[PDB]
Every structure is written in C-alpha cells, then in structure tokens.
From a paper:
At the cytoplasmic face of the NPC, Nxf1•Nxt1-bound mRNPs encounter the cytoplasmic filament nucleoporins [name], [name], and Nup214, which specifically activate the DEAD-box helicase DDX19 to remove Nxf1•Nxt1 from the mRNP8. Gle1CTD plays an important organizational role by providing spatially separated binding sites for Nup42GBM and the DEAD-box helicase DDX19/scDbp5.
To evaluate whether the mode of interaction observed for S. cerevisiae Gle1CTD•Nup42GBM was conserved in other eukaryotes, we determined the crystal structures of human Gle1CTD•Nup42GBM at 2.8 Å resolution and of [name] Gle1CTD•Nup42GBM in the presence and absence of IP6 at 2.17 and 2.65 Å resolution, respectively. The interaction between [name] Gle1CTD•Nup42GBM and Dbp5 also required IP6, consistent with the evolutionary conservation of the IP6 binding residues among fungi. Strikingly, the Gle1CTD•Nup42GBM interaction mechanism is virtually identical in species separated by more than a billion years of evolution.
Numbering used by the authors:
A (entry chain A): 212 to 261, 265 to 311, 312B, 313 to 529
B (entry chain B): 510 to 556
The structure:
C-alpha cells in the first residue's frame, strides 16, 4: 500500500475497449478482422495447457505482428497511458514512435486477459498449468517486435495482477471486515462475496501465475527478461514481512502457490539467499500466523520437505 | 545476471539496505525480516 498508478492503467484499458468498438462502426476493415483476431489469441492461450509445442505461441505472435502492421487502419494511441513510467526514445530501440496502433495495444490487452483467466480458471484447480502460460507471456512480450522504446508492455498484465491479487504488492486486510476483503481482492459475483473456496482457488492460480511470469530465466536468450526475478523476491518479502497481527489466510494461500513447484527455480536464481527466504516463508511466517488452517499446514508441510532436501540450515 | 539484483546497483550503497542484509551476511538467516531489496549475485554464492 497505499495505492499507485497500476489502477490508472486498468481504467485506460477499459476506455480502449470502447474506443475499438466505436471504430468498428465506422471502420469496416476493423470490424471484419478484429473479432477473429481476439478469438484466435484466446484459443491459442487455452490450448497451451493441453514438448516441442510451439505452434500455439507462433499463432499468437503472428496475430500481434499483424496488428502492429495495422492493415485494419486503426487509430493510433499513446502507449504512455498503459505503462507505469513514461518512456523516452531509447538508442538502438526497434520502435521509438510516440504512438502505436490501437488494435495492437488492444490485442496485447486480450493476451493479458487470456493469461489471467487461465491462471484463475485452470491453475486454481491444477497449479501445474500456470507455467506453460507464463512461458508464453514472457516469450511474446519480450519479442523485439513488441518492445515499445526498449521495454516490453508487461505493465498491461501486471496492472491486472494488482486488481485480482493485491497481496502480491504489499496489500493486507482482515478477511472479517468488508474493507479488508476488498483490499485482499475477494471477488463479488452479483453483489455478494464469493465463497471462501472460490477465493482461495483464485489466489492459488494467481499466486502460481505470478511465479510463472516472475521466475523465467533469460540468460540463454538474446531477449531481455520483461519481468525479472527481482519482482518475485520483492513480492515474497512484502508478504512474509507482514506483522503477525495482520496475517490472513489469503496471504498464506498465495505464498504457497508462489513456492510450490518453483522451489528449484527460486534456488537456482538466489541460492543461499533463497534458502534463507524459504526458511522465512515456510517456517517463521506460518509460526507467526494467528490461526492455524489448511493453508498454514500446507506451508509447514512444504517446510519439512525442503528441510529434508535442503536442510534449511546455512548457519 | 542483473535480473536477480535491484535494477539500480547504487542501492546497495545505501546504509538502510546494508542493515536489512546485515543479519543474512553475518548469521546466514533473516532475523529482522526478509529484505525487500534482492541480494547481490555474490551474496547468493554457496560458501
């Protein structure tokens, strides 16, 4: 907390949706193609879940390359409305032009929405499915073709994580108050709060999705990491450093999804510092929790497996 | 590479950040909480 710009991007993206609908009335080339372009991205994202399966990532790249060429003659927009920090022209960058086709920003936004929904709908029940999606997000947004002024458009995706999983960004709350459930991202279907199981399922998929995008290794690639592992480190630290009185099960669920299946990658990046961190996340933090639950237990179970595998002892 | 560290290496010169890491560099564990600034590559080396 308390609050920042990532919400402002969410509003501008909502205003972009209306803009594309208005153009579709006057612009026939945009109406002919925009709908099919949207669907083929969602279909390709959904198929990522179910080894040399590279045909679904290319279909998404080809559509974004087509939207960047802007054959549909879409209006141009200022990308500064969709990034946290206003960007200046960068030396050697592939695209320093101040405006971009509105169809491109829009389909990039659909790609981000598609990944968020996959984290929510599939990774919530089967956390394994978040990793192939995260690979696709990092692969596409890092393509030089899609870098605006030397940096990716990842801020369109991160702005959505801020809405549906604020705990990753330091937000806290009591699950007992309505002001707290809002600050924790507890969703509302038809006015009333969703069940506690649907909430924790959302948190599980989003927690696993965050690790999928934040724990990618790019040193072998010629591309720059759009969301390097420092953001995984910062996200974990904001959660585990929560004072005990303010810990919630929402935090424990996200933290479990952040760690489970990503211990090896976390250790490869940060080695002895990852062990110290996993000790804080899987031993100290659960002990600090004010009430036990299946979420706290799950952390303690992971603590034992890692204490056996790593010894969780550097001293 | 620089991906795991803070994007601005000058941050490790701040005394505030040194204090966050003093517990890990001296005792191997995090005593006063997990540092919000990620570590330097050399600090993660296995001894």
């Amino acid at each position: 907390g308390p609050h920042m710009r990532y919400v402002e991007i969410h509003r501008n993206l909502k205003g972009l949706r209306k803009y594309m609908a208005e153009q579709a009335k006057t612009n026939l080339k945009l109406k002919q193609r925009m709908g099919d372009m949207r669907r083929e991205i969602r279909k390709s994202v959904g198929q990522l879940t179910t080894a040399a399966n590279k045909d679904k990532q290319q279909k998404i790249k080809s559509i974004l390359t087509e939207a960047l060429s802007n054959q549909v003659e879409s209006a141009l927009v200022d990308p500064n409305n969709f990034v946290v920090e206003p960007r200046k022209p960068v030396e050697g960058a592939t695209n320093n032009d101040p405006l971009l086709p509105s169809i491109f920003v829009y389909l990039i936004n659909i790609f981000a929405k598609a990944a968020i929904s996959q984290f929510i709908n599939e990774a919530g029940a089967r956390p394994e499915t978040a990793d192939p999606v995260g690979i696709c997000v990092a692969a596409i947004l890092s393509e030089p073709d899609f870098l605006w002024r030397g940096a990716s458009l990842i801020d369109i995706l991160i702005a959505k994580f801020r809405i549906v999983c604020p705990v990753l960004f330091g937000y806290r709350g009591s699950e007992k108050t309505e002001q707290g459930r809002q600050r924790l991202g507890w969703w509302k279907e038809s006015g009333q709060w969703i069940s506690e199981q649907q909430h924790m399922d959302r948190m599980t998929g989003l927690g696993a999705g965050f690790a999928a995008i934040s724990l990618r290794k790019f040193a072998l690639s010629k591309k720059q990491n759009p969301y390097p592992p420092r953001f995984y480190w910062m996200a974990m630290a904001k959660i585990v450093n929560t004072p005990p009185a303010e810990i919630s099960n929402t935090q424990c669920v996200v933290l479990k999804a952040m760690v489970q299946n990503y211990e090896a990658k976390f250790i490869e990046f940060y080695g002895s510092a990852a062990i110290a961190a996993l000790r804080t996340a899987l031993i100290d933090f659960p002990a600090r929790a004010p009430h036990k639950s299946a979420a706290v237990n799950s952390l303690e179970v992971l603590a034992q497996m890692l204490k056996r595998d790593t010894g969780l002892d550097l001293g | 590479t620089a991906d795991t560290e803070a994007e601005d290496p000058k941050v490790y010169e701040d005394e505030g950040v040194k204090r966050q890491w003093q517990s890990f560099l001296e005792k191997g564990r995090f005593e006063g909480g997990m540092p919000e600034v990620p570590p330097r590559r050399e600090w993660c080396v296995w001894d």
